[PDB]
Amino acid sequence: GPKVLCYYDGQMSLREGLGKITVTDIELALPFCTHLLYGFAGVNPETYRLKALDESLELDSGKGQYRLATTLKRRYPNLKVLLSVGGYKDLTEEKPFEKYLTLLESAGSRTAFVNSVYSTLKTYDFDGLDLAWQFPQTKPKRVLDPEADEHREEFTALVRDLKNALVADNFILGLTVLPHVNESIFMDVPLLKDNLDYVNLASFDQQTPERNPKEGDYTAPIYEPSERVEGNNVDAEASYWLKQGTPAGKIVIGIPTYGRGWKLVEKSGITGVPPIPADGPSIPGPHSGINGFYSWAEVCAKLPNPGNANLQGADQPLRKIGDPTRRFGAYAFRIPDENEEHGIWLSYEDPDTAGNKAAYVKAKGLGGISIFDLGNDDVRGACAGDKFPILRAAKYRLKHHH
Numbered sequence: 001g002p003k004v005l006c007y008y009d010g011q012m013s014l015r016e017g018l019g020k021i022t023v024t025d026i027e028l029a030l031p032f033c034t035h036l037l038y039g040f041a042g043v044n045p046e047t048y049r050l051k052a053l054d055e056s057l058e059l060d061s062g063k064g065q066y067r068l069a070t071t072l073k074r075r076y077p078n079l080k081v082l083l084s085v086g087g088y089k090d091l092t093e094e095k096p097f098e099k100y101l102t103l104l105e106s107a108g109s110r111t112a113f114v115n116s117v118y119s120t121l122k123t124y125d126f127d128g129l130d131l132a133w134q135f136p137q138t139k140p141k142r143v144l145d146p147e148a149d150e151h152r153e154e155f156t157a158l159v160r161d162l163k164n165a166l167v168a169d170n171f172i173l174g175l176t177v178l179p180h181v182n183e184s185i186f187m188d189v190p191l192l193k194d195n196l197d198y199v200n201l202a203s204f205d206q207q208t209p210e211r212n213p214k215e216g217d218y219t220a221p222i223y224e225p226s227e228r229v230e231g232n233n234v235d236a237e238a239s240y241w242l243k244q245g246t247p248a249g250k251i252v253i254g255i256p257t258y259g260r261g262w263k264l265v266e267k268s269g270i271t272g273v274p275p276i277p278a279d280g281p282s283i284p285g286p287h288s289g290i291n292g293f294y295s296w297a298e299v300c301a302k303l304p305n306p307g308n309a310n311l312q313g314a315d316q317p318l319r320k321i322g323d324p325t326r327r328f329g330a331y332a333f334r335i336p337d338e339n340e341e342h343g344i345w346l347s348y349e350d351p352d353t354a355g356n357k358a359a360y361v362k363a364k365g366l367g368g369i370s371i372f373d374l375g376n377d378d379v380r381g382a383c384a385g386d387k388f389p390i391l392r393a394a395k396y397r398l399k400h401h402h
């Protein structure tokens with residue numbers, strides 16, 4: 001059956017107010033998921049063993065959230081609970097990818113990591129590992145790894161080692177290719193595929209305020225928008241893996257549940273059409289405090305709704321631009337006023353466009369979807385009354401014809 005890999009970022013239980021999303025809060029999502037990917041573990045740069053990113057939260061000596069997550073497998077029949085390592089959330093050094101490269105460089109360091117994965121899965125009763133490896137990201141338009149060729153071969157060996165250590169206990173091992181990770185530099189697909197239960201293509205964040213502060217564009221297109229960066233769309237990345245010989249059933253497509261916003265200025269123009277000049281991220285989400293980053297509930301609150309129908313200023317509803325091609329995605333915007341104020345351009349996933357991605361997976365015979373992430377879906381049903389609308393629309397279109 002098709003996979004639905006649902007990420008829960010445990011950091012969200014640390015948030016304040018309506019930003020706090022706990023394990024309990026995401027339980028209503030679990031009937032729609034085949035796997036719960038608990039995010040995120042990291043790597044100790046001195047021992048190369050797995051580490052929790054917040055020990056006080058995750059470990060038995062603290063709040064024990066690892067075990068709260070794995071207990072879910074005893075209340076939701078057939079649900080598999082994996083631990084995801086990396087995800088670009090392991091951010092404790094100035095170059096957060098460096099330890100993900102040096103780990104690969106010796107049998108001793110690879111073995112330390114493998115042994116620490118096995119011990120961690122057993123200790124906390126995880127069902128397997130999602131390898132969301134923090135390779136360096138390709139630089140934004142305007143050398144990535146001088147030892148890329150060495151590291152590519154060492155990564156094949158690491159994945160082989162993990163598989164051989166995990167197989168006796170039937171632990172799941174999957175690979176997640178994070179945004180802007182170039183597989184043709186770092187990954188030997190024909191020598192990886194046989195050791196992986198899935199390959200999850202996190203084909204989103206194609207444009208972001210952090211990488212492209214001066215230009216807004218579609219964050220998660222299915223196909224290539226005209227004259228964009230070749231490869232940076234779902235169809236291109238899935239086809240890359242297929243053309244390397246990967247079984248279609250092993251390929252899973254990542255779907256974001258969030259939006260990213262850019263501040264608009266005078267040089268942005270007045271049409272809202274991308275790519276659009278900008279000046280960094282827009283205002284932080286009301287419930288998270290993260291600049292230019294919005295959960296689906298936060299995006300939907302900015303779109304035309306009865307509460308803000310005739311509101312003005314920072315509250316004036318955004319203009320939605322639907323995508324009739326269904327190839328590129330939705331965006332919404334407010335042109336800056338005559339004082340260059342309150343301008344925002346927001347590219348986001350919604351239930352309809354997430355459904356389009358799941359329907360693409362079904363039509364192409366791929367293996368499933370992943371959801372990045374449950375807590376950025378509309379957990380509480382604030383947008384339209386229905387909880388987990390993005391997840392539910394994607395799951396529905398993954399299995400039901402249009």
Ligand SMILES: *[C@@H]1O[C@H](CO)[C@@H](O[C@@H]2O[C@H](CO)[C@@H](O)[C@H](O)[C@H]2NC(C)=O)[C@H](O)[C@H]1NC(C)=O
Pocket residue numbers: 138182183184185229230231232
């Ligand atoms: C990933 O790396 C490869 C090289 O390993 C890049 O390959 C280039 O692809 C473009 C088309 O997108 C070609 O015009 C170039 O001739 C290719 N060069 C090489 C050396 O192969 C690829 O573009 C990279 N992709 C990203 C997104 O960075």
